[PDB]
């Protein structure tokens, strides 16, 4: 059924699963036309498909050309996500195919289920979690590859860098979700926190800085502070 706080350690067991998030698939800027009407201009997007256990991210870049001449783009975005996830599964060896796919928005359930009719033994699930994966485009290297794409392209990342060498997946996913929650609540503060010290760098093959265990505790504290804070600034508490 649906994924929630109670069945949360299921994410880190040994049944292959993917989160799919479609928030950033159809992205637009809204602007005024010469005539003073409003119009949208689409910008590149991405499907955020993530193995929460391994950290493996299958970032499918959605080039604006996909949208040309199409109508009802928000609804088509859902079907396009579903088509691309199903092509991804089909590309994978049988022993790598997920046993479950958890979608972060319930509107993706029917689209994915229809595209996956060929995989009756792959469970398509919703979740009750308010996961912050939309903030993925606040990760500079991810944003950079999406905006530079000139054609459809799959880029493969490990969103945990090398963290799993030192922490469990459960701790890795908790860290990720805290970083992304922070980036979503106040991107500027969040990024300030992450880069303040110029002596901590981001390896070329990594997404986040090379913090020590002790430094990650401090960072994690600072992000929690931020998230409680902005919650006050917003609710006045």
């Amino acid at each position: 059924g649906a994924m929630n706080s109670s069945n949360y350690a299921e994410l880190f067991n040994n049944d292959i699963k993917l989160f799919v998030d479609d928030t950033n698939v159809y992205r637009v800027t809204v602007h005024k036309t010469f005539e003073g009407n409003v119009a949208t201009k689409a910008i590149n997007g991405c499907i955020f498909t993530l193995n929460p256990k391994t950290g493996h991210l299958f970032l499918k870049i959605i080039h604006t050309s996909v949208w040309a001449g199409q109508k009802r783009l928000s609804q088509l975005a859902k079907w396009k996500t579903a088509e691309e996830v199903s092509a991804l599964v089909r590309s994978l060896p049988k022993e790598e195919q997920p046993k479950q796919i958890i979608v972060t928005r319930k509107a993706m359930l029917d689209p994915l289920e229809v595209h996956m009719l060929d995989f009756p033994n792959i469970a398509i699930r919703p979740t009750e979690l308010r996961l912050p994966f939309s903030a993925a485009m606040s990760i500079d290297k991810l944003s950079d590859v999406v905006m530079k794409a000139t054609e459809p392209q799959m880029v493969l990342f490990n969103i945990y860098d090398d963290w799993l060498d030192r922490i469990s997946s459960y701790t890795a996913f908790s860290r990720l979700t805290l970083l992304l929650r922070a980036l979503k609540t106040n991107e500027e503060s969040a990024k300030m926190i992450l880069l303040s010290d110029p002596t901590i760098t981001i390896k070329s093959y990594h997404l986040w800085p090379s913090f020590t265990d002790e430094q990650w505790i401090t960072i994690e504290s600072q992000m929690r502070d931020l998230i409680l804070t902005e919650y006050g600034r917003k609710y006045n508490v």
Binding site: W79, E83, D110, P111, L117
Partner: protein
């Protein structure tokens, strides 16, 4: 005009014949139903005074043989049977009519209700949905499950309605996933009409039989089947004009006849609101929408 005699009425029972019904008291001198219109299917049906659960009954066509009812005290229901001795049957019926122990099928001359509810229903198709080939008539009750229900347990006693499933490979062409899921025209016109049903009359006939089972026996799989066949048409952008116009008439008379206090278990809010207000055919059911809004505005 044909006759369904009753051997006797040993138990108190509410007897229905098509959309008419009447109370017979325990061991009341009752010997059947006369003046039944030829040319239509019919359904005789029963609700025991003691046990109002398990309403049951028999679909039949008097052109297909001489049928009578007889109570069985072992199995404890009124059973339909065929009399093969035509002379014995005429004699029995004539005696009972002379003694006036028969109720008359009470059709008002102006009244086309039954015809409109059964226009496309044929006994030969009923018998393929209700498989019991040794009899010319077909038994249905409240509890019988459908073939599709059994996929989600006794196959001999099932309703073999055409399986319809909007999220199935049959319904969805590879590579037309979005197109076929949002516009079911393919599934309606090619798979179902051309492929399975052959023509819209067999389609409407199953649809009407599903409703009647749903209304008369509160059969839940039948109600599901009726709504599914409606939804498949309403969700198809391309439907022959003649089918839409006939659907409007079909549904109109079902809604008109559906008793008011049975509507909340026999009407699916989601399907009706979608069909009437969201679907491709939202503008093509003028009569059905008008009666629904005047009679069941709550559902909408």
């Amino acid at each position: 005009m044909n006759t369904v005699p009753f051997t006797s009425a040993p138990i108190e029972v509410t007897i229905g014949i098509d959309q008419y019904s009447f109370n017979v008291k325990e061991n009341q001198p009752f010997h059947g139903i006369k003046d039944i219109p030829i040319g239509h299917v019919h359904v005789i049906h029963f609700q025991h005074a003691d046990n109002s659960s398990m309403r049951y009954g028999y679909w039949f066509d008097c052109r297909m043989g001489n049928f009578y009812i007889q109570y069985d005290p072992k199995d404890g229901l009124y059973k339909m049977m065929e009399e093969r001795d035509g002379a014995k049957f005429e004699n029995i019926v004539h005696n009972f009519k002379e003694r006036q122990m028969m109720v008359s099928y009470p059709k008002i001359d102006e009244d086309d209700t039954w015809y409109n509810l059964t226009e496309f229903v044929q006994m030969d198709k009923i018998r393929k949905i209700v498989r019991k080939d040794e009899n010319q008539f077909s038994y249905v009750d409240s509890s019988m499950t459908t073939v599709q229900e059994n996929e989600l347990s006794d196959p001999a006693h099932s309703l073999n309605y055409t399986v319809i499933n909007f999220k199935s490979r049959e319904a969805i062409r590879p590579g037309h996933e979005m197109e076929d899921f949002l516009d079911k025209s393919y599934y309606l016109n090619t798979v179902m009409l051309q492929g399975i049903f052959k023509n819209s009359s067999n389609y409407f006939g199953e649809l009407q039989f599903a409703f009647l089972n749903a209304m008369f026996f509160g059969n839940y799989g039948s109600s599901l089947q009726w709504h599914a066949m409606i939804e498949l048409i309403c969700s198809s952008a391309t439907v022959p004009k003649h089918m839409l116009d006939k659907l409007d008439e079909i549904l109109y008379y079902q809604i008109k006849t559906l008793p008011e206090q049975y509507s909340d278990i026999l009407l699916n809010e989601r399907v009706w609101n979608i069909c009437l207000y969201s679907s491709f055919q939202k503008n093509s059911l003028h009569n059905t929408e008008k009666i629904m809004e005047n009679k069941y505005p709550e559902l909408l």
